[PDB]
DNA sequence: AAAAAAAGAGTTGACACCCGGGCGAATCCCTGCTATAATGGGAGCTGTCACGGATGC
């Protein structure tokens, strides 16, 4: 989308976000985003960052 | 110089017949009635644009 958002169409219906296409399956939850964007750890309010 | 008849008309009975209207008979159309248990549906694009307009918050 030009809002630089991802839609889902299926045979050429109303347009919805794919996100609802996603929680249909098994993924739901956290697991859509933890198998596309890596996390990287960071420390509990240490001594400076 | 005269004077009556095959046609031309006109009918008068004498069949030949040809669809019409009935008498039949033979046969079509409608309608309903069947008693174990039946319980939500199958394609169709989706390889043209572009314009010109109609709804919505």
Request: cysteine-free.
């Amino acid at each position: 989308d030009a809002k630089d958002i991802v839609y889902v169409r299926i045979d050429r219906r109303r347009k919805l976000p794919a996100t609802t296409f996603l929680y249909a399956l098994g993924m739901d939850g956290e697991e859509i985003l933890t198998t596309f964007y890596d996390v990287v750890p960071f420390e509990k309010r240490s001594g400076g960052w």
